[PDB]
Design a binder for this molecule. Structure first.
Ligand SMILES: Nc1nc2c(ncn2[C@@H]2O[C@H](COP(=O)(O)OP(=O)(O)OP(=O)(O)O)[C@@H](O)[C@H]2O)c(=O)[nH]1
Ligand SMILES: [Mg+2]
Ligand SMILES: [Mg+2]
Ligand SMILES: [Mg+2]
Ligand SMILES: [Mg+2]
Ligand SMILES: [Mg+2]
Ligand SMILES: [Mg+2]
Ligand SMILES: [Mg+2]
Ligand SMILES: [Mg+2]
Ligand SMILES: [Mg+2]
Ligand SMILES: [Mg+2]
Ligand SMILES: [Mg+2]
Ligand SMILES: [Mg+2]
Ligand SMILES: [Mg+2]
Ligand SMILES: [Mg+2]
Ligand SMILES: [Mg+2]
Ligand SMILES: [Mg+2]
Ligand SMILES: [Mg+2]
Ligand SMILES: [Mg+2]
Ligand SMILES: [Mg+2]
Ligand SMILES: [Mg+2]
Ligand SMILES: [Mg+2]
Ligand SMILES: [Mg+2]
Ligand SMILES: [Mg+2]
Ligand SMILES: [Mg+2]
Ligand SMILES: [Mg+2]
Ligand SMILES: [Mg+2]
Ligand SMILES: [Mg+2]
Ligand SMILES: [Mg+2]
Ligand SMILES: [Mg+2]
Ligand SMILES: [Mg+2]
Ligand SMILES: [Mg+2]
Ligand SMILES: [Mg+2]
Ligand SMILES: [Mg+2]
Ligand SMILES: [Mg+2]
Ligand SMILES: [Mg+2]
Ligand SMILES: [Mg+2]
Ligand SMILES: [Mg+2]
Ligand SMILES: [Mg+2]
Lengths: 120, 338, 246, 109
RNA sequence: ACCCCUAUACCUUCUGCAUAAUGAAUUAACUAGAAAUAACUUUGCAAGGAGAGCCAAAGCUAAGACCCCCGAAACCAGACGAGCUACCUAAGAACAGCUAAAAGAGCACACCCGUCUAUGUAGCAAAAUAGUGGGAAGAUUUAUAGGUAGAGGCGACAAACCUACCGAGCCUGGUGAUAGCUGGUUGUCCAAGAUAGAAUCUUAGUUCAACUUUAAAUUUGCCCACAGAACCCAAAUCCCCUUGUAAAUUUAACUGUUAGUCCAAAGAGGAACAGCUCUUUGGACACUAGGAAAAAACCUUGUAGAGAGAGUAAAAAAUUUAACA
RNA sequence: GCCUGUUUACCAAAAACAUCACCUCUAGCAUCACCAGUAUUAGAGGCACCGCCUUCCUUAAAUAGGGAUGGCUCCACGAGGGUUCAGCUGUCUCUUACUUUUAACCAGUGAAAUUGACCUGCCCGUGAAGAGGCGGGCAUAACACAGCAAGACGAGAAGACCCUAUGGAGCUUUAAUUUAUUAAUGCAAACACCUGCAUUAAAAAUUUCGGUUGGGGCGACCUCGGAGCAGAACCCAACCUCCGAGCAGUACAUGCUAAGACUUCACCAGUCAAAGCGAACCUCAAUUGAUCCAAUAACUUGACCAACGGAACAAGUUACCCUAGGGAUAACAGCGCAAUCCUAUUCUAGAGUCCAUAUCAACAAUAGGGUUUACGACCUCGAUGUUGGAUCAGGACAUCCCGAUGGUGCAGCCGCUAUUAAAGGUUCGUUUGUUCAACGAUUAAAGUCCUACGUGAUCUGAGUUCAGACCGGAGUAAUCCAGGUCGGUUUCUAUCUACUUUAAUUCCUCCCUGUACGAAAGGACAAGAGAAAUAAGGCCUACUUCACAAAGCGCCUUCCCCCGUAAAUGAUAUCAUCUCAACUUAGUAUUAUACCCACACACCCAAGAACAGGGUU
């Protein structure tokens, strides 16, 4: 029968080679995920559909910010094959109230607190 | 499916089918005796009253004697040179009063075919003998064995849980729970054919009452008649099953032990060929030699009460007569020499 | 209407049919839950709370005897004789707050209701009414328009005779000698001093009680009420007088 | 030639898992034969169903199994065990939650 | 205008129809959802409401809103039918010629019938024409009038005939018979919306459950960390705080759906065949579009409009092979 | 079947019905039949006159035909069913000529079924599974007129056949319920008749004929429980695998009550149970049954209602049938599948006197095919029976013959086997529906298949399929039958698509030649010549049917390959090697050509349906 898939934990234990390849430090892990649905929930189990709805990824190619905490990670593990996960990078720290209306999420995963739309 | 057939075979009652078969076979088998056997089988069956040794046996025997029944077993022992079953004189058709519980809480006597007791008597249960009843589970012979002195335990097996339950009920009604509690009585719902593997060279005395055509019951009872068309396969394969059961019993019995093969049918095929085939199969496949005991003295001793088919090669055959409607009962005694 | 089948064809089975299975409303054994329901007597409850409320709002005048006619006129209770209503039963509900001195006539009365009525200085009597007399009492004006003489009030049925002859129930047919004993027993049981109504200035009104065969207080059986000209015709024939007095 | 065998499932098993709050009398688990044995404040019905005798929390544990001496078959089974062996069974307990009552001031006589 | 590219009429019945499954030549006209119970909304009055009766532990009064059409073979009652045909009654008629003689004789006209062949098959004809053929003084053919009438008649029994269609006539009436069966069921627009089973003279249906819809109440619903769920003799599941979420349960009312398909997986039967038959988990299909050639079920992808903008998803088969001492 | 007669008006004329004769049963009698009669009579019925008793032949070939109380007995007769001598003839070999009708054109008049719209092609594939409409190719100006019937699963009856419906109806019954009605009696009432009530029959009347499975049977099952399928909460089917139950034993507190829970997926029903009163100090798988209704003072009890959620009481048969539907459900057919079937390779066991591999072939293995017997129920049940035969054939090659090669247990001739080749051909008769088969005679051969087991709007209906009737058998009967037999209505005027004038083969004879080969007996190739036969295309000088002409039975002409291998030179690999090495031959298709080629009224015609065409000097 087709059932829910239990991913062995060793799959989610990064190696030094992975750290070098993907540019992430196991110490000081990133706080927030940017998750995009890059795959349709159609022809997937109703539980994956429900997990996508819970995570708020109904629209594809629409980034959503989520906490990098074990429960959200469990959900993202359930629906990992339909999504792209990247760290949220904050070169200028989290936006302040002053610049909350001038933010922009770069395709690189960086939330710039200033967005002037002018040449550098 | 095809609904409209050209000619449908006439719908016969199983009783009439059994009559047809018994005619076409036993007429040839017995010649001029077949008329008498047929009328005896179609007439009422003469019953014997086996007094429950556990109950007030002396009092019940006195009451039956007052009812004018005499102990055929006792008179047989008189000229033989522990069982008590009373039967009426030759020609008498009187019925024994229905048995009722005694003062001790057990039925005073069992109303059973007298011929059914001859196998047990011929088995000759010595004091303290380990006993097996491979498939005998209608009651009757089993109760007679228990009333005998097989204090070294008796294993009564059958393949039919319904008949096992019937055995258990008659044991509750007749045999005291004190007697039945220990391993003195072990009732099982297993196949006799497997019994050779389950136990071998264990029992000193064995009784193999194989399923058979039960001629009288086939002629009388319409329900579950062996001669009905649906059970044609079982009827045809009966000889092989009987041979297998007798072989299992012979394997089970200890070397030098005695077995008795019993059948409630007149069929030469189901009796003499069955015993001979069992002997041959045992001596070939398992290389064990069995010698058929001579029961001619038994025939002469019990002739006064039962009429026997003199022209019998192996074993004894009580045939039902009007003067004594006790048959049919074939029984063959076999001592396992090796 | 769906697609084909009995439901679309408009010919689905009757209500309660279960497709041939023995229906639920038929596989349950018959029991006498409603046997003789149309013959069981019914009495409209009249709580002392409702009685006090009516007295307070003035829809019921305690200065005059209170009977079923007065209650109906004040709209304190609705009676349906056609529905086997045999009258009004006094209900103890509101006894602890009842503070009205009234002379009330009912058909049934609880012990506590009687106790409260008597403690407040009033008088309560349980009076039987046959269905016809009850209908006349509840709606007298239509009866007067029917143009028939006022009929006699029938006696209670044999089963009800003991109730209305027992003094403890203040039965209108009970022995008046036993009334003081019953009232004293109630007063002793419920811990209030029995007020001697004979000293009350309204003692006459409290003592007024219609004759057992009488329906209205001042009208005798056999009289005819001509409402058109405001008159009452009284038969004088000896046979009629004897019949209406019997 | 194979008849019968159309009996439906008995819907037996555990009705209250570990940690579930259970009121007195609630059936905890129904079994055909003793899969789970009664523990503390757990009673057994005629059909070997386990019900809560007190209002509390259900807990499943493993405990050494010492049957009643009158239980002849179990006693013989034990008698055949080696010296070091100790039987174990799964038991269901109800940890009572509330106290069985409190003392209240009724009258200041 | 065509040429270019895209496009497999509609309705109904279906798991699924361009389907070579049904209906339709077409125009006009006519042609098919009728209602209580209890609910909901809106008023009135209110512990009472109502124009007697009835209801009432906020009810009661009033209104609004809700339930199709065509079609059997049949059954029964009363009439009408023997101008056809079956048989019979009365009183009539016909039967050349030859042969044999007095014939249920022979050949053969009239006459009656209808063996075989061909034509015809909406025909000349709702049973005929041509030839051929049987009888043709007899149980023959036939004109006239009368008679037997339908749970009946009559019958050289073929279940034949009884006014072209008799295993039981025809007409009228009950009758708008009934039909779990077939077909049909007519303005616009939006929205939610698809199958656990049980019982059944029941498997072409229906009642309940499940699912679904609407309105209302308040409160946890789903996902789910440990801990936890058996001895005999695998994938997973259940329970489940956090967490991400916003749904869940209950109350009131009510229909409809309960003849399913293929794919992946675990099985059972078959032959480790079937586009084969069953059960279980999931997906898709009965719903849009793109792709695999065409394509219900495979892959991508969905929430809907306009644009003569843009980035992408799935998405194109691969291979060529034998010397030898 | 005795005969004459009768019958299904309108698919059966008969062996069926009747029939004289014979036989069985019933009735002793008059004023409406019988009958104006009386046992030699009348009625009902059976049966069929009379009479009597008790392997060979046919053919050449033969599934054909004939002969070795009841039962025999064919004299006569028969539009009955078979066989047959002789003759006859266009039935046929093998078709032709002519006349009339029809037909086509001109003139008048002028329907019918049918029809979703059509701007209406072919091949392959796809698909609700056989497409004009979809995908990829190919083709493609436009229209008339006349033919054809391959398709439009063509048009005609909500076809034929099969299944279903808590649909009908006819019939039979030992189906259930009745005896209202008649005929008998008996008891009452009256003094035989009448009436009432009973009993027995006859006669009828009403109603029903459960469900799931099983094609070659002579049935099984229907409710409940345990185990696997369903491994671990629950749940889980089967026309799946096994095993069981319709109780028994104890006790008599096996009493009363009551929180809270479980629950067979609904309900109904079924389970467990704290506490309390009162007492002492039930078990295990299932072991069953609702309502109503009966019995009972009450307590309580009652169906093997087992078709086990249970109609209170009802079976068969229908082909005499009917209606409503079903491709949801059968048979032909199509479509899946390849168990079975067939073919080819691998392996060498073994045969082949020795020898695996000339040839055959075991166990097995691998592929290919969709020609058999099955399985599946996916399209079609809202007019297509089916098998054979006639006619015309299209196609595959897994080749029967003819052609070219290799091997051989190939001396030659015969052969066997394998590769290549589908241009052409592949007979006529007897029995029998018969395909097939057997038999007779031939042939170079008398190939295996597919094409809706090709083709039935082109034909036939011989078997088989409805109504009729027999023999045998089943059944109480009505009726039935995979059996045998006799008979039995085969419609369509063509709207659309498609189509309607496109270098031969073989046998035999002779020569080579009774030569090669061989010891002989036998006996070849190649090449050449002559005769025929068929097939195609023409023609009428003869002959013949006939007659200003059309025809065959008459005459004339018919013309090239195809390639499997056998070799030369020669490397990779200095030999060798025919070469998916370069290369040289047998070796050729690139059919060679032939035919046709003129843009321009009326009459006749060898030209023709019309139109068109040729001649008019
Ligand atoms: N509860 C119950 N009711 C029964 C039983 N037998 C009969 N009945 C009732 O009677 C009906 C059956 O009627 P019948 O079949 O005539 O009964 P019967 O006893 O066989 O015969 P009669 O006495 O002639 O009625 C049932 O439906 C019940 O109403 C039974 O064993 N139990
Ligand atoms: Mg419809
Ligand atoms: Mg089971
Ligand atoms: Mg169509
Ligand atoms: Mg249809
Ligand atoms: Mg049409
Ligand atoms: Mg007439
Ligand atoms: Mg004449
Ligand atoms: Mg004549
Ligand atoms: Mg006639
Ligand atoms: Mg007949
Ligand atoms: Mg007939
Ligand atoms: Mg007519
Ligand atoms: Mg109708
Ligand atoms: Mg929507
Ligand atoms: Mg029923
Ligand atoms: Mg005749
Ligand atoms: Mg004749
Ligand atoms: Mg006819
Ligand atoms: Mg006629
Ligand atoms: Mg005819
Ligand atoms: Mg012939
Ligand atoms: Mg014209
Ligand atoms: Mg095609
Ligand atoms: Mg044309
Ligand atoms: Mg078409
Ligand atoms: Mg139809
Ligand atoms: Mg439940
Ligand atoms: Mg049932
Ligand atoms: Mg017939
Ligand atoms: Mg199917
Ligand atoms: Mg070839
Ligand atoms: Mg085929
Ligand atoms: Mg025929
Ligand atoms: Mg036949
Ligand atoms: Mg025939
Ligand atoms: Mg004929
Ligand atoms: Mg035709
Ligand atoms: Mg034509």
């Amino acid at each position: 029968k087709f059932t829910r898939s239990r991913i062995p934990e060793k799959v989610f234990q990064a190696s030094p080679e992975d750290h070098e390849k993907y540019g992430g430090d196991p110490q000081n892990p990133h706080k927030l995920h940017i998750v995009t649905r890059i795959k349709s929930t159609r022809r997937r189990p109703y539980w994956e559909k429900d997990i996508i709805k819970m995570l708020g990824l109904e629209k594809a190619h629409t980034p959503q910010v989520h906490k990098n905490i074990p429960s959200v990670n469990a959900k993202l593990k359930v629906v990992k094959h339909l999504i792209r996960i990247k760290p949220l990078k904050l070169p200028q720290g989290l936006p302040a109230e002053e610049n909350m209306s001038n933010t922009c999420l770069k395709s690189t995963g960086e939330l710039v607190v200033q967005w002037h739309l002018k040449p550098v | 499916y095809k609904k409209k057939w050209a000619a449908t075979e006439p719908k016969f009652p199983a009783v009439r089918l059994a009559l047809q078969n018994f005619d076409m076979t036993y007429s040839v088998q017995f010649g001029d005796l077949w008329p008498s056997i047929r009328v005896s089988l179609l007439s009422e069956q003469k019953y014997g009253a086996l007094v429950n040794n556990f109950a007030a046996w002396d009092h019940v025997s006195a009451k039956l004697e007052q009812l004018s029944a005499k102990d055929f077993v006792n008179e047989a022992i008189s000229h033989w040179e522990n069982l008590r079953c009373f039967t009426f004189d030759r020609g008498d058709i009187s019925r024994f009063p229905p048995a009722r519980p005694g003062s001790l809480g057990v039925m005073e006597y069992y109303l059973m075919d007298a011929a059914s007791l001859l196998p047990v008597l011929a088995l000759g249960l010595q004091p303290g003998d380990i006993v097996l009843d491979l498939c005998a589970a209608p009651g009757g012979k089993t109760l007679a064995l228990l009333q005998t002195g097989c204090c070294r335990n008796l294993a009564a097996n059958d393949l039919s849980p319904s008949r096992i339950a019937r055995l258990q009920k008659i044991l509750h009604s007749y045999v005291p729970e004190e007697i039945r509690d220990g391993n003195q009585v072990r009732v099982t719902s297993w196949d006799g054919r497997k019994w050779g593997e389950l136990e071998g060279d264990t029992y000193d005395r064995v009784l193999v009452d194989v399923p058979c055509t039960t001629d009288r019951h086939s002629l009388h009872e319409e329900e579950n008649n062996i001669f009905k068309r649906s059970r044609k396969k079982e009827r045809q394969i009966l000889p092989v099953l009987q041979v297998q059961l007798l072989a299992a019993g012979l394997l089970a019995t200890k070397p030098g032990g005695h077995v008795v093969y019993s059948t409630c049918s007149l069929s030469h095929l189901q009796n003499e060929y069955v015993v001979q085939g069992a002997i041959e199969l045992l001596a070939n496949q398992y290389s064990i030699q069995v010698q058929v005991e001579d029961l001619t003295h038994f025939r002469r001793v019990f002739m006064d009460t039962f009429c026997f088919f003199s022209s019998c090669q192996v074993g004894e055959l009580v045939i039902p007569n009007l003067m004594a409607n006790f048959g049919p009962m074939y029984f063959c005694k076999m001592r396992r020499l090796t | 209407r769906g697609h084909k089948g009995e439901r679309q064809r408009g010919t689905r089975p009757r209500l309660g049919f279960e497709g041939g299975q023995t229906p639920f409303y038929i596989r349950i054994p018959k029991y006498g839950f409603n046997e003789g329901h149309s013959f069981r007597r019914q009495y409209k409850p009249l709580s002392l709370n409702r009685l006090q409320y009516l007295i307070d709002l003035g829809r019921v005048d305690p200065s005059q005897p209170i009977d079923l006619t007065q209650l109906v006129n004040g709209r304190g209770v609705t009676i349906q004789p056609l529905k086997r209503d045999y009258g009004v039963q006094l209900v103890e509900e509101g006894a602890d707050t009842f503070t009205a001195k009234v002379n009330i006539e009912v058909q049934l009365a609880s012990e506590l209701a009687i106790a409260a009525i008597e403690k407040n200085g009033g008088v309560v009597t349980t009076a039987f009414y046959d269905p016809r007399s009850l209908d006349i009492v509840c709606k007298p004006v239509p009866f007067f328009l029917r143009g028939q003489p006022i009929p006699k009030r029938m006696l209670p049925p044999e089963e009800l005779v003991p109730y209305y002859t027992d003094a403890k129930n203040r039965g209108y047919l009970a022995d008046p000698a036993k009334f003081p004993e019953a009232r004293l027993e109630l007063a002793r049981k419920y811990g209030y001093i029995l007020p001697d109504i004979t000293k009350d200035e309204l003692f006459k009104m409290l003592c007024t009680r219609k004759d057992p065969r009488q329906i209205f207080f001042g009208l005798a059986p056999g009289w005819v009420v001509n409402m058109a000209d405001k008159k009452i015709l009284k038969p004088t024939d000896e046979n009629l007088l004897k019949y209406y007095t019997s | 030639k194979n008849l019968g065998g159309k009996s439906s499932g008995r819907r037996q098993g555990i009705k209250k898992m570990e940690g579930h709050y259970v009121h007195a009398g609630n059936i905890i688990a129904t079994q055909r034969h003793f899969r789970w044995h009664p523990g503390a404040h757990v009673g057994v019905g005629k059909n070997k169903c386990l019900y809560a005798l007190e209002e509390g929390i259900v807990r499943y544990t493993k405990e050494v199994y010492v049957p009643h001496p009158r239980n002849t078959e179990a006693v013989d089974l034990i008698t055949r065990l080696p010296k070091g062996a100790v039987l174990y069974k799964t038991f269901v307990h109800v940890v009572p939650a509330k106290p069985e009552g409190t003392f209240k001031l009724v009258a200041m006589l």
